[PDB]
Write a protein that binds this ligand. Structure first.
Ligand code: A1BPF
Ligand code: ZN
Length: 140
């Protein structure tokens, strides 16, 4: 579980979005596993605007933050799960690390701010849904 809180926006994994999120929808993309809903109160997360490939992510299944090197956002095959059929997920970055069901929503951060959130796992890899291209998160 986990979310990003920036301005009047809440960014969560689309597959974990609640009834309150769909009832206050701003934007969603199934191919990216992202959903953004509106909030009443202003958030304090800063979204990174950079091309960093090293950062630190939170792993809830270990109660630990791990420093990782991660790949550039790309179209990557993700196996079928209870949430999506087998498909290419876009804007996804991989790192070598631990990610289990329950870890989605953990933040990945670099020196510039929030880079993305955990979206995939297994086989000793962790995948993060990038949010650095969503420039509109910083305005209105
Ligand atoms: N974005 C997606 O399509 C993911 C939806 C949730 C399940 N996905 C995973 O990668 C798995 C996982 C392991 C750790 O966290 C998640 C489930 C076993 C691997 C795929
Ligand atoms: Zn950065």
């Amino acid at each position: 579980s986990g979310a990003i809180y920036v301005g009047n926006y809440r960014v969560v994994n689309r597959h974990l979005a609640t009834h309150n999120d769909w009832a206050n929808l701003v934007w969603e993309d199934s191919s990216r596993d992202l959903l953004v809903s509106s909030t009443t109160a202003q958030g304090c997360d800063t979204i990174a605007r950079c091309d960093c490939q090293t950062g630190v992510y939170y792993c809830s299944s270990r109660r630990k933050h791990y420093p990782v090197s991660f790949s550039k956002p790309s179209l990557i095959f993700v196996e079928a799960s209870e949430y999506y059929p087998a498909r290419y997920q876009s804007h996804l970055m991989l790192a070598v690390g631990h990610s289990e069901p329950g870890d989605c929503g953990g933040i990945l951060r670099c020196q510039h701010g929030v880079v993305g959130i955990v979206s995939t796992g297994g086989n000793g890899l962790v995948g993060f849904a990038d949010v650095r291209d969503l420039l509109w998160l910083d305005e209105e």
